[PDB]
Structure formats: structure tokens, C-alpha cells
Amino acid sequence: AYDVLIVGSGPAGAAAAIYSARKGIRTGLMGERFGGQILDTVDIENYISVPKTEGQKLAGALKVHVDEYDVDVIDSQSASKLIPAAVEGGLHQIETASGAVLKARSIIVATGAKWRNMNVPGEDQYRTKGVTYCPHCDGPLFKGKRVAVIGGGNSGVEAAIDLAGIVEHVTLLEFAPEMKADQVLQDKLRSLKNVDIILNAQTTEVKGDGSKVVGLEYRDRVSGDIHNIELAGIFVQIGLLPNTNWLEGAVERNRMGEIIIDAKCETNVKGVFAAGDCTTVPYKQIIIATGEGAKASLSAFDYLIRTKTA
Numbered sequence: 001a002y003d004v005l006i007v008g009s010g011p012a013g014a015a016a017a018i019y020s021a022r023k024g025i026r027t028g029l030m031g032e033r034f035g036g037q038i039l040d041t042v043d044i045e046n047y048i049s050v051p052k053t054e055g056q057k058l059a060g061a062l063k064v065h066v067d068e069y070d071v072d073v074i075d076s077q078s079a080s081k082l083i084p085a086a087v088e089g090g091l092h093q094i095e096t097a098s099g100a101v102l103k104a105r106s107i108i109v110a111t112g113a114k115w116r117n118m119n120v121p122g123e124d125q126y127r128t129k130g131v132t133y134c135p136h137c138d139g140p141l142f143k144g145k146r147v148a149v150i151g152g153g154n155s156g157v158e159a160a161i162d163l164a165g166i167v168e169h170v171t172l173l174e175f176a177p178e179m180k181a182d183q184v185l186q187d188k189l190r191s192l193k194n195v196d197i198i199l200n201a202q203t204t205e206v207k208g209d210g211s212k213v214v215g216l217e218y219r220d221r222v223s224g225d226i227h228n229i230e231l232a233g234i235f236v237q238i239g240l241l242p243n244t245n246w247l248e249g250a251v252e253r254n255r256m257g258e259i260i261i262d263a264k265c266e267t268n269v270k271g272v273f274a275a276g277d278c279t280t281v282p283y284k285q286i287i288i289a290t291g292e293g294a295k296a297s298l299s300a301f302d303y304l305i306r307t308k309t310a
């Protein structure tokens with residue numbers, strides 16, 4: 001029985017583990033792959049105080065930092081169910097897909113999320129070489145270049161507006177006959193001179209020169225006609241899917257599947273906290289996730305000292 005069991009080992013979970021183990025408590029960190037989303041990216045220029053680093057290096061540094069403390073790091077395990085303590089102060093349980101069950105006085109869920117993919121040939125090949133899922137992260141890299149934003153929800157429309165102020169031209173492709181973003185965002189986007197919006201648009205292929213992106217092919221869903229666009233960057237903003245369906249019925253979630261948390265990262269279940277992209281935190285970034293993990297760790301500690309075991 002851990003004093004705290006952190007589920008997910010991306011930036012948020014790692015931060016939580018460091019904060020928890022620093023208090024000398026029995027700390028477990030169970031995740032599918034240490035490092036989380038940062039493992040698939042290269043250049044990171046917004047991890048505050050570090051002008052430039054990369055995913056591999058950063059995940060490595062996160063592991064070293066976690067290993068400076070007494071943390072039981074469990075890797076390649078997926079939480080499949082949360083069994084809330086039946087009685088106040090009782091142990092919470094995390095079951096795994098592999099068939100194990102772990103017990104803990106407090107839980108910190110930090111399972112992150114998955115950005116939906118275009119699922120087209122060329123997408124994988126060009127990830128980090130023009131295909132990007134983060135406007136906040138890579139916007140600064142496209143000055144003077146043409147780019148596309150895939151997705152017409154708030155995230156995509158905001159991203160297109162954001163990029164339009166930095167890049168040469170932006171083309172937003174919306175799968176549906178209409179964008180779902182708030183009207184104010186739609187009006188703002190449509191008012192920009194260096195932006196063109198394509199509705200009923202389904203991307204079909206990412207084209208590159210063997211090294212980086214050079215274009216995008218898509219299909220018009222109404223006519224079925226195929227079209228091409230020249231560009232250097234493709235920002236995929238279809239949607240974010242929090243890794244939280246396994247918690248269905250155990251902890252409240254908002255309409256987007258994000259775990260509902262208050263400022264202290266507390267869920268509706270006492271002793272169960274959550275941090276990072278899997279929560280209702282409004283923005284999804286490494287530095288934001290790390291700060292949240294620290295908060296959740298501190299709240300879990302406060303919970304432990306305020307509640308009597310069993």
C-alpha cells in the first residue's frame with residue numbers, strides 16, 4: 001500500500017512523484033511509458049528556463065530527477081479500473097490491464113491525453129518534420145511559411161488565428177459543413193486576410209520531400225474531388241482525447257472527458273487527485289503539466305495528514 005500511487009508517468013506524473021517522494025512517503029509511479037507525450041517530439045523551446053531541449057533529453061532528465069528520490073517506478077502497465085475506498089480513510093485500488101491490483105492511501109491520476117490523428121499516409125513520416133499537434137509549441141517555427149490547421153473547433157480556429165499573426169498564410173480544413181468553434185472565433189478567423197477556410201475537407205495525405213512537409217492533399221466530402229495545397233506545416237487540431245475512459249463512473253469528468261478538478265487538483269473522490277492533460281486544466285503544455293503534478297502531490301500529502309488510516 002503506497003502512501004501515494006501516481007498513474008501515468010509523463011511530465012505531470014513525474015513531477016508528482018518527485019514532490020511526493022521528497023516528503024519521504026511511499027511513492028509509486030505507474031505508467032505505460034515514462035516521459036509521456038514528450039517522448040515523440042524533438043525540439044522543445046517553451047519549457048521555462050530551458051531555451052531549447054528535446055523530448056528524449058527531457059524525458060531522460062525527468063527520469064534522473066525522479067530517481068534521485070525513493071520512487072517505485074513501474075513501467076509498461078496500464079490502469080484499467082479505480083476502486084474507490086469503500087470507507088473514509090480506506091485504501092484506494094488501481095487494477096491494471098495485465099491483471100494486477102495495487103493499493104494506495106491516495107491516488108494521483110496523470111494519464112494525459114492523445115491528440116487525434118489525421119490517419120493518412122505521410123503523417124507519421126513527417127511528425128516533427130512539419131506535422132505538429134501543438135500550435136503553442138511550434139507556431140514560432142513557421143515565420144514566413146504557409147501552414148494548415150486541421151480542425152474547426154475552438155482549438156483549431158484559435159490556432160489558425162494565432163498562426164495567422166506569425167506565419168505567411170494559414171489554411172484551416174474543417175471536415176464538417178460548418179465549424180463548431182464559438183461564433184466570435186469564427187468571425188475573427190474569417191476576418192483575417194492571410195487565411196482561407198475549407199469546409200467539407202478531409203485530408204487524405206501528407207506530402208514531403210523525404211525530409212520535411214511540402215504539401216497536403218485532401219478530399220472534398222461533397223463532390224469527392226481531390227485537391228492539393230503547398231505548405232510547410234500542418235497543425236492537427238482535430239481533438240484531444242483524455243486517457244480517462246477507464247475511470248468511467250469512478251471519478252467525475254466534464255463533457256470533454258477531462259477529469260474535473262478544483263484548484264487543489266482534487267476530484268470528487270476524497271484522496272483521489274488528478275494532474276495534467278487528463279484534467280480540466282485549460283491548456284495542455286509540459287510546463288503546465290509539471291506545475292499541476294506538483295500541486296496534486298502537495299494536495300495528496302495534505303489529504304494523508306488530515307485523514308486517519310482505515
Ligand SMILES: Cc1cc2nc3c(=O)[nH]c(=O)nc-3n(C[C@H](O)[C@H](O)[C@H](O)COP(=O)(O)OP(=O)(O)OC[C@H]3O[C@@H](n4cnc5c(N)ncnc54)[C@H](O)[C@@H]3O)c2cc1C
Pocket residue numbers: 007008009010011012013030031032033034035036037038040041043044045046047077078079080110111112113115133134137138243246275276277278284285286287289
Ligand atoms: C508531438 C507533441 C509535441 C509536443 N511538444 C510540446 C512542446 O514543445 N512544449 C509543450 O509545452 N508541450 C508540448 N506538447 C504537449 C505536452 O507534451 C503535454 O502537454 C504534456 O506531456 C502533458 O503531460 P502529462 O503528464 O499530463 O501527460 P502525458 O505526457 O500524456 O503523459 C501521460 C502518460 O500516462 C500514460 N498513460 C495513459 N493512460 C494510462 C493508464 N491507463 N495507465 C497508466 N499510464 C497511462 C501515457 O501513455 C503517458 O505515458 C507536445 C505534445 C505532443 C503530442
